[PDB]
Amino acid sequence: VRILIKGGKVVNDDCTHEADVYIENGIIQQVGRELMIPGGAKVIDATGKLVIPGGIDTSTHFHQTFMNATCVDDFYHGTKAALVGGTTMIIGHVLPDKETSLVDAYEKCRGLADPKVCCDYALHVGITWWAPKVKAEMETLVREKGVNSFQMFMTYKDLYMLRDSELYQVLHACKDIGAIARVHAENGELVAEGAKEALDLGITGPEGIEISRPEELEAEATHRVITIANRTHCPIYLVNVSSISAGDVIAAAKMQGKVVLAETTTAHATLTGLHYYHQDWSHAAAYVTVPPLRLDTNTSTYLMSLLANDTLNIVASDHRPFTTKQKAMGKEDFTKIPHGVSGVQDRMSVIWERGVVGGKMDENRFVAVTSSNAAKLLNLYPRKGRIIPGADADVVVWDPEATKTISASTQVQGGDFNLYENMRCHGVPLVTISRGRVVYENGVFMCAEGTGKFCPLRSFPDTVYKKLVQREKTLKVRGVDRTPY
Template sequence: MSNSGSMRILIKGGKVVNDDVTQEADVYIENGTIQQVGRELMIPGGAKVIDASGKLVMPGGIDTSVHLQQNFMNARSQDDFYSGTKAALLGGTTMVISLVLPDKDSSLVEAYEKVRSLADPKTCCDYSLHVGVTRWGPKVRAEMESLVRERGVNSFQMFMAYKDTLMLRDSELYQSLLSCKDIGAVARIHAENGELVAEGSKEALDLGISGPEGMEISRPEEVTKETERENGTAHCPMNLVNVSSMSAGDVIAAAKMQGKVVYGETSVAHAVLSGMQYYHKDWAHAANHVLAPPLRLDPSTPNYLMGLLGNDTLSTVASDHRPFSTKQRSLGKDDFTKIPHGVAGVQDRMSVIWERGVVGGKMDENRFVAVTSSNAAKIYNLYPRKGRIIPGADADLLVWDPDQTRTISVTTQAQGGDFNLYEGLRCHGVPLVTISRGRLVCENGAFMCAEGSGKFYPLRTFPDYLYKKMVQREKVHPHTHAVRFVVVKTLTSPKGGVLGTSSWEETSE
């Protein structure tokens, strides 16, 4: 019964929360879609009635950054598409977008097809795929067009970090952005300067800094701040991901004030934890917090980033879920650059953001829906099929108890890994019921969903939320592309010396 798309469900007596309004209403679901929203509904018999009195009824979460069954830095992430999507559903997330990460010399299409073959038999919820662009040339551009036209991809991720493996040179990045604009795709940018990170890492190791604290020392805020400032100049709708610092957030705020079509995505870890974790006396504890960009030492950073989520400077918060075991992290026991980057969080994202965001006074329930679901749906052209509770939308919903609490622990998690970043955190806000495409998949902690019952969700190009703004901006500023400029930055080392400089040049087509 739980896997039947034709199941009839009436959610009765709750408050329906969308990103712009909260209203008392019942919700009737049939054939996998929301059929009616309102009071005194006329519905056919035989529906399962869920009592939501005193509870909130919200769109299911959309996690835009997960890395399931992914090989990275000589290790494979601990969750496959079954365990990862199971954990997502248990935590209140009903759709994930995972990253396809091609090797430097491999085909984008072949890498995509390989991930589809791994995911389709296992996933429990709807999923889509971003595809990484790790090199550039005519073949890559042609494959991007093929993925967009024939395979339901509408987003590509480019890296300015990971020199010699994932990083694109400045000219390659610029060409990839132009291609994204031409084909109507969303450009996702991991904004760290790979050259300066490589120099900083070498110098830290030369100084005898080999532990996890080397991550923060070798990747100071300036590496991301200036890189994101450069990206703010490109004339392509962009989603800057893994925003980790106050200064990087300020760069996005300034770009938005100038009317640029730039959206920021942070992760739960960056919005909750500080970089002091890297100095923990237990190496394993410190190493289990390694991700890129790193957590920041300034203890006020998480509170600041949560505030930026609350005021719409940052649009979305993802889990960036890529768990590794402590044993896998021991690859970098004597060299922090070899610790695989990634943390777990797909199961805890919703509850942690509710606790620190809503209970913490940084946002209301409507803004919570925006940053965990609706904005992601808008950016990736899912809205209003997903991210909103209205007739005709996919029946991806939660019955959320804002007063019930749970204490996070690695001993009770469904997600992979042997460590939990939020161990012992007592969270208000628990999904009592999770419904995915009209299927009752979780109820009071019980999981009722068959492996492989989820579906790949093809994404359409030219999302209005991004491209309408860009088209209007170009009408107002028709000579935007005639601008030519160079940005040069200098970064100092841990000893105060100059690590190097980097420049960005843009010319008209």
Template sequence: MAANMGSMRILIKGGKVVNDDFTQEADVYIENGIIQQVGKELMIPGGAKVIDASGKLVLPGGIDTCVHLQQTFMNASIQDDFYSGTKAALMGGTTMVMALVLPEQHCSLLDAYETCRTLADAKACCDYALHVGVTWWGPKVHNEMETLVREHGVNSFQMFMAYKDMMMLRDSELYQTLQTCKDIGAIARVHAENGELVAEGAREALDLGISGPEGIEISRPEEARCPIYLVNVSSMLAGDMIAAAKMQGKVVHAETTVAHAVLNGNQYYHQDWAHAAAHVIVPPLRLDPNTPSYLMGLLGNDTLSVVASEHRPFSTKQRALGKEDFTKIPHGVSGVQDRMSVIWERGVVTGKMDENHFVAVTSSNAAKIYNLYPRKGRIIPGADADVVVWDPDATRTISVSTQVQGGDFNLYEGMRCHGVPLVTISRGRLVCENGVFMCAEGSGKFYPQRTFPDYLYKKMVQREKNQAYKGVERDPYSGDVAKVANTMKKELGLGPIDGESPNKPGGRMHQGVRDLHESSFSLSGSQVDDHVPKRSSARILAPPGGRSSAFCNTPAILKLLRQCYCAAHAQLQQLRWEHSDSNGKPINRNNGTAEKGDCARLNLFSLVVKPILVLSH
């Protein structure tokens, strides 16, 4: 059946063709899985199936950039495999999905990829691609990333700054992963939360006796991060930072989810535990009721580039694994089937975006970012025949009782949506018509992706050419050089007094405590003297003045780093005074302990700075 479907000739007649940049009244002729002609009064061979699209819109098929299928996560099996998940996608007007491969820590990325390919090839109904998660780091991971790109058609990798002890990378590991992505031309997807703070927040919430789903919101305060491709943007603050970065010309792209753009965190305080737990997603939905509308507006003005479903459905019984402890509730919601209709209702019907921008955020932008365009995400001759006939006036009411996707709860239960896919065509195969599904299991194909997408890298390559650093040829300076005043050096702690050994303790400095101004660091994030035992020091959770957004150009970053350095040094000196007696001996006032190098981790290459230094200039 799949072969016959692929060789079908189809004429879509009388509709309005909608691309991301224009709309036109035109017919569309499809043959051999490819769009052959677009226009009026086409010369069509006999025997073509005619689809009447009068009064309807003809859209490029949707591309869902993040789904989770046929996996086990947080001790629970996801409710959709590659058949049911891609079937639900097609029923909702999405013709391509991108699934995330999550290797176990210290397991081979290649093996995890091959396992996922085997599962997907046997069941998928539509085209699919794979992101591969980088859940640990080492030379083997670096080599396998290169192999996946070179030989297996993978062009995107996802890193996590959350899920401590599961998938979270350390600072130096994240830096090396981002550098590798740049070197091989891959897309760096970063789930940007602070894993240390999330873990600490969870402990605090549990200590307060908060064990219900509301703890997921309490333990994860809003954070703004700035990778090259930021996933799951959930807050107004993060949106503002992305908007500011784009205004400055930064190469920043960001993705939100349907849930974050439609719902708010008040759901976590619902009296019904099962209802509240069904909304557990990370980052969590935000409490401010204005957040969803704000995020939808950012989708409408192109601050946010893509909307994904982040489809990962679980049953109520599975979520009950965390009935006494919210940290054990499996994170995930459904949405692959409803993504297109919900965004049309809350985006187009409300006037936050027009039909062309709807195509952009649900299809075309993803195609451009992941180097699929214009084969995907556009209706033109030569493109893959992934086409949806869309009725903007028809309505449907979302219900778990009628959904195809897995799970026993629908976040949008009872929502009445305008915008219904009447016909879905995937690579020239008529797979859905008027609610009837007709596609064979396993008829979908893996879609290999090329690296170095112009949409991301072209601007950066040009900037590197323009900003190449060159030394200045000049005659050497031959004038007098002033001496540094010893008094100032001693009082400010800028270094040893002239003639004094750099390693000799002096003043209020104590042996065994690293001075930031004397400490060397490497771009890997480690300190050159990490092998030397240190006594415990006072823990500093954040640099004075708060966290930096890091959306800066290089001179501004250097200025910021100097300011942080001076402030950190001043605070470190203050800590020494507070933890010393009159003879300069250390006092342990709280019997607490701190990890080795905690003070030194007020280092100049913090997480939010490294990605911009490496990738955005």
């Protein structure tokens, strides 16, 4: 199949220019004005529209069982929703229980995903415990299973938390094999104590998740893991950055030349924790995730500015929807509300509205935070994240003059609540092209399950590791030459 996108503006993360785009056999063939193409192409009129790289969502949890609930979206519905939302690649999470095999958990995820995915994907692997067998499995995964990123938690005590000596060893191992170390940095002991205290004070409602983990617990842990990472010489990637305090730690570390990257979520970047205090339990529960949304009304604006600024690099949905009925496992004990919100479909439009229409960043920075930075990180750039000849034809024809209002009743992503309910959005995907085929057009989705493919991710991505080679020569530490005492 052969596709001509005609009359639009191509928007990459570096600049915008008027140009048509010609696609064939999964691949962008030409970009320019007045192209010489074979006749019989499908012509897509993009006048007045922007032609952007499809979104890449670096955090998704399709099919995941978590806190005794199974995410409502499997790999087919989740990728569909992504595509209807202008995202053309997802990275899913693998989360083995403590003491279980990382490789088995990865293979099980591959088995669920390969036959269902509608778009390209790859996987992060969780490191929820530490032992010789874990290190050997890390290695196997990077060496031959196309993994280059692991996820660790500083919180979820007794479930997924690693202690400081374990993190030290884990980061050392990630660095040796050229992997990215993703970390969720809240202080797990202080979280556990805070939750227990709040319950003992009679706070059982969803607001407990905000009260029990104030932002200093995030800032502290973020500061600690940056320091551990800097001592092991491992690039560190903070996830779900939620607060001004943690943003400030990250900015100060970056000023000091430390190798720190950071990601936030659509929700953290746009919504306040005031939702946890809503009179309706279900509404309040529906915003429950960690670290929690914050009360400080400056939080959104500041996180959005950090994104515009490249203090935060990447924005993800962290999609993990649950229904109100599932959330209600914690109707009487907030610590049992499963953590997850929906957003894989909302991400592009929401960030467009608050980021670009809101004047925090321009359309090019929007591409950077929604695809290009991720692609570099994953070692997939410019194959993904850029409209140029030779790249994968993962392309969105984006309408910056659209009329969409977001609602749960029209969404295709799972969950019974949409967090952005009633938000007017000026940017929507008009057409989505994935692997050089139109999968969404005129409001209709059409794609067979299993069309998408796993994309092995090569180790040592340049955008982080290239400078670390030279930096490692720079840390030349020698003693003083004395004669012996």
